Amino acid sequence: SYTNSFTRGVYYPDKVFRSSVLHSTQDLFLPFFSNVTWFHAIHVDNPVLPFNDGVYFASTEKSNIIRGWIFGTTLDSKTQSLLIVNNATNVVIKVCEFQFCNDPFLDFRVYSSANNCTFEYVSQPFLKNLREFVFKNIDGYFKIYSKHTPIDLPQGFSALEPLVDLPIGINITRFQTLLALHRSYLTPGDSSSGWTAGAAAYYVGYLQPRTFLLKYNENGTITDAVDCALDPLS
Amino acid sequence: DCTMYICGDSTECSNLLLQYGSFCTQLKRALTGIAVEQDKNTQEVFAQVKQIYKTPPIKYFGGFNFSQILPDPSKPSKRSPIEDLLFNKVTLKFNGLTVLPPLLTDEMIAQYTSALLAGTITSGWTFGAGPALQIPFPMQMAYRFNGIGVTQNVLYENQKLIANQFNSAIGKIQDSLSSTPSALGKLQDVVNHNAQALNTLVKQLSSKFGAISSVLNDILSRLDPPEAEVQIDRLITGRLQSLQTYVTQQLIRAAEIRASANLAATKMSECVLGQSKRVDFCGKGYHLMSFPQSAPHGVVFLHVTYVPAQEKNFTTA
Amino acid sequence: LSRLDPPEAEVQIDRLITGRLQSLQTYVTQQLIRAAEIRASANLAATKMSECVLGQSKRVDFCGKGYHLMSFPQSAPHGVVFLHVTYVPAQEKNFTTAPAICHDGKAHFPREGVFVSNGTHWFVTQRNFYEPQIITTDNTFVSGNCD
């Protein structure tokens, strides 16, 4: 499918504070009123999703049906592929040198056959239930913004707060969602494991280098943002 | 501050700045001349009178109503309701940029305006050409009507009508000034231009001007003494080129303000302190009198104009 | 050009030329501003010479503070000094004034001046010099009744 992200896809551009002023910055932002891909009816193919300028991952997942994400170069043997797996009370962020299958599922613990991870990075567990995420890679820092806001995408305004930064530099051109259900299918090749669960939809929207003018209130929270290459009034 | 704006808390930058020449003692010599000039424009129009006159206690001038132009003793700041309305509409030390306050405050200009009003109401035009002479206001109006060609009988007979029309005009001028919010545009434009030029200098200090960074404490800590110099030299050049144009624009704006103040003083002397025979120098039409009102950065002249109306066709020979 | 060798003296000569041209551009700008100021002052002085020396003006403080009569120019190495002759009234006195006079059922108004009174007496005089004259028909005109 294809839908529109009207006024969503904004985040904090830098770790600086302001008080009821306006800040114009040329950053990598999501263009307002764009055409994002609403993949709600794809209940496990087509995992070929690029990572040129990042990804805007929006979801309204009911409760813990997502298990994590994977960002790799080509998903081949001896290729750096980061896997962020969110358990109940802890998340695991390791980069592996392994050949990943079409849809590595989690319900299983070992994704591929010959896994070989080398990093160590543990953090706080991450996982009307809107879960906004924005992923990017710049200055060798795999940078993520996360937000948990109650709701599809409404017409409101909510900034994305930088939560965790982690240093790594690779040619990240991979993206796929990891679902969770009841029926256990150990077969990696068979990409058909549809189970009767809640609504699942992984939003995909690519970022773009644009100039954004954000308005910082007295408390330092972005409450309004305008773009500078869409509407003439903007 | 030529030393602090270009060189932030750095003794080596101060030693390097003196080699550029005498720009530091010229950019501050021109700006202080601008200030002394601005301290004089506010004395050629408001300080034209020598002795301060006052309004008599009896508030009966003959039928007219000047409560909106005379100072109000209730408000601690002695001003008129029109001046109070004008004062509530003009919306008004960072890195070595200070704002010097004017000599004549908003209270002494108000006193000069009240003195000029008393002189032009009680004495007429004699308070600006010698000793003040008392004269009734209806007789002053008859004088001003005969000065333009209209006989004094139309005023000595239809005095109540003229008084009511003047009172209605004085009452409606407040609503007219309150209707259009951009009426005091000439007084807000100068303030906006000043605050914009004062704020554009701090915004250009963040520019690297070719160097690696913008702050001196970073260049004097990452790089070693003789490779930081061409960088300090380029930074000083960039910060001096941004101040020279600022001083030039300030001089141009000061010359414009001086010309405007000379014109305003001429209008005050030829319209408030007497009646002029010019067409559109003291208002559009037949000028009778003019009342001054102070404003945080200017003067508002209220010109009383006599306009004929209800004309009729006749035969002439 | 004597300590340093040809191509390492150039960036130095380039910087010196830039510094000496930036110091002259601002000088020319200040000279233009001062020339515009001098031109405005000279236009004002020429207007004052034409309206005060070459005739009498009715302006209040354009040819001197007061009532202008005449103006005499004087040269100066870089300017002109205008000597304005001013007529100033003095030694004023209190008097009684009235708009008109009702006589024979008609309200008569003075032609020039105002009706002055000094106690059980009424005369006509101008508004600039006390000259008591009897109220006659020549200096008065009827414009209706005194109602």
Added chain:
Amino acid sequence: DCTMYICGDSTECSNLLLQYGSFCTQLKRALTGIAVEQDKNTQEVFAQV
């Protein structure tokens, strides 16, 4: 146009001009104010009636 006059066709050159900051804005802000002023002088003498 600061961008076409200084940096003509050259994206690399324009990215250096942005590091000089607000000079270009204060230039066009004044040049258009000059035009607005010139559009007013033709209305104080001819548009009196």
Added chain:
Amino acid sequence: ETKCTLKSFTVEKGIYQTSNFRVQPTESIVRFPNITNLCPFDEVFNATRFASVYAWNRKRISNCVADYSVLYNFAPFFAFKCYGVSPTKLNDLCFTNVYADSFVIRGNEVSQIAPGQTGNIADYNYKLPDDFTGCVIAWNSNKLDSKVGGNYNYLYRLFRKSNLKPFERDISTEIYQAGNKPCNGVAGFNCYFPLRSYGFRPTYGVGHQPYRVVVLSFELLHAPATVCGPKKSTNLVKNKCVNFNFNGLTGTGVLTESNKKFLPFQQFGRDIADTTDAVRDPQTLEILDITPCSFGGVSVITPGTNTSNQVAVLYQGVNCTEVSNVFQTRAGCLIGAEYVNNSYECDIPIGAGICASYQTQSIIAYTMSLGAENSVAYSNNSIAIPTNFTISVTTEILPVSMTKTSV
């Protein structure tokens, strides 16, 4: 100072600006963040059992604060030779990785652990790079790695085809094919075992006893540095402008508390002018506003050497509660003059309606008088008629031309 500024000797009457008053900071703070991941140095130096010389144990030290000053708990080191660096400057330079290679060797073989040196150990077991910028530490371990019968568990390679390369390891146990006779896995003539064992005993001397040697090699790849040594001081000075270095934000100003509630991810604040206005304390979570202390301009109000020499100082645009009659005006504050309460004619302007002059005695300070007071009696039946005339002369000087110049 006025004569130096004006470049003259007979200054006239008036107010002249000479310099600027700047408050110098007294102390200087450096509040960088609390210390944390002390690198695992103690587990490499205080280990329980070291490896052989040929199987030298390596740990990579990365993403951790390196306190290289926990070295000095281990006793007088037969060698702390720091090659390419100083033993004192090492706790400063950040580096990408710090590889720690530990191994046990004899006492006579501790000198062979260095660049260029050759022998029996650093030719086939553990060779160091020629341009090795690091630190080799070595200390005796007799009490711990010596058994009466003999600790034959520590091995070492004696024979090899060719020497090793910088940081190369060999764990093969094939018989040394010395002669042309091809060995068949059996030992004997011209076919000897390459790995021998150490006869560590307590009765040995000081040159043959077990010596533990570690080598810390610093790596500075183009990759960002993740192992940076420690840093800190401790003053949250208030109501006084000092030099702050809060987690890299450096400046000078008064650090006073505030109510500017920041978000969790952000460290410093900015006004509209892009200038810094507040900063997080990298230790206690509390926001303090940065405000400059007393700063302004000094002006000498001199009556001129023609009259006298008593001058007055005026600090403009600054309250002088901080750093001769002190009086605070609306345009600043002046010292050296007395505020008189009779309004006279303004002679030397100051600002906001205050003027100075010489009474004659001392410099005075008074509110300027706009003129005299005269209230005419306005009556509807009274007039003022002049009687006499006065012919006066008024001088009006106006410039016409300028000095024609050319360059």
